[PDB]
Design a protein around this nucleic acid. Structure first.
Ligand SMILES: [Mg+2]
Ligand SMILES: [Mg+2]
Ligand SMILES: [Mg+2]
Ligand SMILES: [Mg+2]
Ligand SMILES: [Mg+2]
Ligand SMILES: [Mg+2]
Ligand SMILES: [Mg+2]
Ligand SMILES: [Mg+2]
Ligand SMILES: [Mg+2]
Ligand SMILES: [Mg+2]
Ligand SMILES: [Mg+2]
Ligand SMILES: [Mg+2]
Ligand SMILES: [Mg+2]
Ligand SMILES: [Mg+2]
Ligand SMILES: [Mg+2]
Ligand SMILES: [Mg+2]
Ligand SMILES: [Mg+2]
Ligand SMILES: [Mg+2]
Ligand SMILES: [Mg+2]
Ligand SMILES: [Mg+2]
Ligand SMILES: [Mg+2]
Ligand SMILES: [Mg+2]
Ligand SMILES: [Mg+2]
Ligand SMILES: [Mg+2]
Ligand SMILES: [Mg+2]
Ligand SMILES: [Mg+2]
Ligand SMILES: [Mg+2]
Ligand SMILES: [Mg+2]
Ligand SMILES: [Mg+2]
Ligand SMILES: [Mg+2]
Ligand SMILES: [Mg+2]
Ligand SMILES: [Mg+2]
Ligand SMILES: [Mg+2]
Ligand SMILES: [Mg+2]
Ligand SMILES: [Mg+2]
Ligand SMILES: [Mg+2]
Ligand SMILES: [Mg+2]
Ligand SMILES: [Mg+2]
Ligand SMILES: [Zn+2]
Lengths: 95, 129, 43, 144
RNA sequence: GUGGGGGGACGAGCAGGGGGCUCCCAAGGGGGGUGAAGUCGUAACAAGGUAGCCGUAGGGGAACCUGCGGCUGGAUCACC
RNA sequence: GUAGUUGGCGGGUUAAAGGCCCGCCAAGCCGAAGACGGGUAGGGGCGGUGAGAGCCGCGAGCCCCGAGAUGGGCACUGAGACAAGGGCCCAGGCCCUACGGGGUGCAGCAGGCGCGAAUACUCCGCAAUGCGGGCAACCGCGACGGGGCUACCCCGAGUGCCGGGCGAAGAGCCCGGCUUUUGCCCGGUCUAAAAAGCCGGGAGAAUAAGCGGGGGGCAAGUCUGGUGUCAGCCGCCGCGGUAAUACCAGCUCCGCGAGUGGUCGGGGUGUUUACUGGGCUUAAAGCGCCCGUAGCCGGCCCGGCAAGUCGCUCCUGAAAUCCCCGGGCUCAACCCGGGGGCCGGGGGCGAUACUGCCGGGCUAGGGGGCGGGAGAGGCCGCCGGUACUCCGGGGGUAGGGGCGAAAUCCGUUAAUCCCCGGAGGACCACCAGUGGCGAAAGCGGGCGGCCAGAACGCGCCCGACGGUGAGGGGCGAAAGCCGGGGGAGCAAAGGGGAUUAGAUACCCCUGUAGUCCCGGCCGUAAACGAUGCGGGCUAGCUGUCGGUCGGGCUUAGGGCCCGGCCGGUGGCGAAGGGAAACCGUUAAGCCCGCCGCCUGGGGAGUACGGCCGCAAGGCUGAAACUUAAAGGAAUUGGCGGGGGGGCACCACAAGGGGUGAAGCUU
């Protein structure tokens, strides 16, 4: 049976996708079907009491987006296996 | 590409009647559409047939009465002889007393009942019930 | 496989005891339905 | 996916050609038209045939059942082909000998193929030396 | 009426090829497929324990493995 | 494909036209609307089956036409033959013979052998029906008629009836009364004569029932004996391995009955061939995509014809067969009389609604345009962006790299790391989206040039120019092939380090084709929306892209928001549809067209053949044989080296005591 009307990748009215490479992997997928979670990121986490407002310590915080496949995304808890009724509910992937 | 206007018009009535609509617009149109709708109105399957004048052939607006259980055009336009109309009668109609066929005979378009009284056959057009 | 063989061909047919049966003649078609009418429709 | 296809009033010839094209998809029609029944059947289109018994051979019933159905190997007189023929009835194989003419006939079953638990046998013996095997088995006659 | 030589159309038959159409027999092999479970692994089904499958190429006792491109019939209908 | 082949002209021959044949001239004739080749078959009336459409040929027997007389040819006579019981020659048999010769071929009626599963009397009459001959009378006829044999088709009957007892209400036995269809004998009639029939007479219940079945389908036994997964049954399902309703038997019952069974073939079965009337997302089934020839299907109005079409009538469509009605055999089967049909062909007269053709006119489908915008659409040229690898130099020592952990490996001729420069090939991060473009494949940096295709706006132009499209053509990922260039990273094959029972795998180091460019070939893919193309109709709500119009704002912008239309692209969901998942204005709904494909599984995308290719291979594509399921969707559970929650000293954590070792009891 055709699970998912989407086919698993929101491709659109085209024939082919450019595809990317999976971090921690390389099994990967096209541009759709690839998880692209973004996390805030910053070196030296909560040392801002003893750093930053101590000496000068101009600290930086770089938004980083990570790309994964279905294997890695399920492996790192970014993706669960939802029930059938819950498959159609659009929830953000905790950033 | 639009090929047969009579089948297009007859299916519009079937579609609009099944939604319980009061009227239906028909376009494009020919004399065969009009002469068929006159036979329909003569048997109480159709209300008033108003005509509109555009540059593109013209339109008919037909008031439906909920009197149609099914309708459609017989394709292809089969020739039929007078002695054969009984056989075609039981093909498209339920019961011996219910429903009519629309025949295009040399004297004009008439119901299959009026063709049987005249003792002539012709080219089959449609069925109503 | 199966423990059969061609050497046991018809083994059971010669093993049943031979009980003689009575002679019997069957009824004609008219007499049959007379019998069935008397035994089913009647008591 | 719509409007079966050649539906015109003057589409009679084309419609008949299209329907004749797909008759060959029917295995029954293709076999009858190509003369396949009378080219590979050992009986050669006949309902029965004569033959000479060569060796009493036993085939085993299929897996769920357990038995040794006792058949015989026959060579058809009219063809010379060798077929395995099932000898029915309890003790019916005992009325068979070697080098005796037997009338060979189809065993029934679906489509003229083998019967229920007997694998790969299409024929059964009906006559032995010009007398029916059921007659011998019932005692109504005796083998000559 | 004829008897010879010959020319003609029709044309058997016997000699030969030439082609197919068919059909048998043939030392040996070639890819197969059925039994009943004998051997070696465990490839498929669960994330089948290296997600699976399609085409192609190479490789290997064997199932199969690897490279490339594709698909989800995926274990995801879901980023900010 | 054809080469006397296709035609023309002049001749010959014929009873007669003709490439029928001949002399000359030309290149024509047939073909995908299927030539040619192969296979099969005598054609029709008709017959079987089905409620019908239809399917099949039992299209044997009877009637009409054809051809043949052992195979192949050629002539005599005759009105007519190139002649089944006439002729001649060759081939191939056989027969008699006095050896010099001479006959003969049963596909005539009987009959024999042979083959095969499979088959009648070497009988009677020219009386009926006809024919040849005769003025006639009449003669002849294996045509024909009659019977024989034969489970040939159809029809009507018997194998007792009435009452009673035993028996069971059954069968059967016995008793009392009745009848004689029928069997037997006789007479008349019939018949060419017999036979049978019919009429009449005699004795007499007296002379006469089988075939297949009882587990379900499917009517009939959980009665009994025997066997014990053996033997046997079984169209399918399925039984039998000790208590068999399925086997062998007894008893009993069931179906039909002078029949009843077995194997075949056809039809129904079967909407599994689908015109009526199937299906193709997932069950088998949409060609990877497109251009188009034949074909099929095609807008509106006006006038003409009357081809199709419709109505009437006529000449016909042999008889038999079929349907209805009447009559005659005792009814029946059957025979006779009459009407209809036997699906069609042609004639005449009428109608012109639709189709067809001809003519005139339109703009709604289509094409061609103009305007401002949109777009990773294509080809070509130039440039850039980081990143990477390598090379040269400077700083600085001794590690780096990699892993689950290591090792291989790189490094003390200075590495990894940092800085200054150079070279090179590939890619175009974020923005960026069920966003865009394209027929599909596919296309993602900027500028430019040459092209293409669309959408929107339009009182622009033509005037049906259209749809689909067998065959035919073109484009068509990756891998791969041919020849050249290039080669950073990656990486089939291979080399090594590990792991392992093994490890020719999974990991690591390394590594060559290949990946990239050019010219050509291949022509395949889960080439997928597993959903062919064109058109119309059928609630809506919501996101977004392009154009446009109206209203409100303006980073006064090609900008933003609200609403309408057109065109795309997602989600939910009317009606409706579906086996269900689900589709639902982007249909898998209601319709109109055309093309492709499917008809249980395996054998098998295999074999043979053909075509294509440098090759790999590709396209097209069976059958024998084997089999009773394979298969779709969904439900309950079970299970998982999937996820989540709860719980327990027959779990753990924190503890306490132990057992496991010695001797001994058990
Ligand atoms: Mg694709
Ligand atoms: Mg079977
Ligand atoms: Mg495994
Ligand atoms: Mg390998
Ligand atoms: Mg390697
Ligand atoms: Mg002449
Ligand atoms: Mg000629
Ligand atoms: Mg005869
Ligand atoms: Mg001859
Ligand atoms: Mg002769
Ligand atoms: Mg002969
Ligand atoms: Mg006579
Ligand atoms: Mg009878
Ligand atoms: Mg009693
Ligand atoms: Mg007599
Ligand atoms: Mg019996
Ligand atoms: Mg019994
Ligand atoms: Mg029953
Ligand atoms: Mg039974
Ligand atoms: Mg079907
Ligand atoms: Mg497609
Ligand atoms: Mg194909
Ligand atoms: Mg086209
Ligand atoms: Mg006419
Ligand atoms: Mg009559
Ligand atoms: Mg007739
Ligand atoms: Mg084509
Ligand atoms: Mg390539
Ligand atoms: Mg490497
Ligand atoms: Mg290299
Ligand atoms: Mg497909
Ligand atoms: Mg469906
Ligand atoms: Mg929906
Ligand atoms: Mg194929
Ligand atoms: Mg081949
Ligand atoms: Mg469950
Ligand atoms: Mg503890
Ligand atoms: Mg101890
Ligand atoms: Zn990954």
């Amino acid at each position: 049976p055709k699970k998912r009307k989407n086919r698993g990748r929101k491709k659109g009215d085209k024939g082919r996708e450019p595809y990317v490479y999976c971090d921690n992997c390389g099994k990967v997928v096209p541009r759709s079907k690839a998880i692209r979670l973004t996390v805030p990121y910053s070196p030296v986490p909560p040392d801002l009491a003893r750093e930053l407002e101590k000496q000068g310590a101009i600290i930086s915080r770089y938004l980083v987006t990570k790309t994964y496949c279905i294997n890695c995304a399920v492996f790192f808890g970014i993706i669960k296996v939802r029930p059938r009724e819950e498959r159609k509910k659009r929830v953000p992937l905790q950033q | 590409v639009m090929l047969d206007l009579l089948s297009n018009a007859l299916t519009a009535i079937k579609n609009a009647e099944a939604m319980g609509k009061r009227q239906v617009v028909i376009w494009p149109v020919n004399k065969l559409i009009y002469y068929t709708l006159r036979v329909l109105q003569r048997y109480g399957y159709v209300g008033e047939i108003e005509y509109i004048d555009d540059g593109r052939g013209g339109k008919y607006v037909v008031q439906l009465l909920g009197k149609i259980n099914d309708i459609g055009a017989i394709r292809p336009r089969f020739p039929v002889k007078y002695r054969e109309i009984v056989e075609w009668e039981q093909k498209y109609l339920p019961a011996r007393q219910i429903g009519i066929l629309v025949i295009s005979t040399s004297q004009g378009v008439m119901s299959h009942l009026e063709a049987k009284e005249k003792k002539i056959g012709g080219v089959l057009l449609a069925y109503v019930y | 496989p199966s423990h059969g063989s061609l050497t046991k061909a018809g083994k059971v047919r010669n093993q049943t005891p031979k009980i003689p049966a009575k002679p019997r003649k069957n009824l004609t078609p008219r007499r049959r339905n007379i019998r069935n009418y008397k035994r089913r429709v009647l008591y | 996916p719509g409007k079966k296809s050649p539906y015109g009033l003057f589409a009679g010839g084309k419609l008949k050609k299209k329907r004749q094209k797909f008759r060959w998809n029917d295995v029954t029609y293709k076999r009858r038209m190509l003369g396949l029944a009378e080219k590979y059947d050992p009986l050669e289109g006949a309902p029965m045939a004569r033959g000479i018994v060569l060796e009493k051979v036993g085939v085993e019933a299929r897996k769920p059942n357990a038995a040794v159905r006792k058949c015989v190997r026959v060579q058809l007189v009219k063809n010379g082909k060798v077929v395995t023929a099932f000898v029915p009835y309890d003790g019916g194989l005992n009325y068979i000998n070697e080098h005796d003419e037997v009338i060979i006939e189809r065993i029934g079953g679906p489509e003229g193929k083998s019967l229920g638990d007997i694998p790969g046998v299409r024929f059964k013996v009906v006559k032995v030396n010009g007398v029916s095997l059921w007659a011998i088995w019932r005692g109504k006659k005796q083998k000559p």
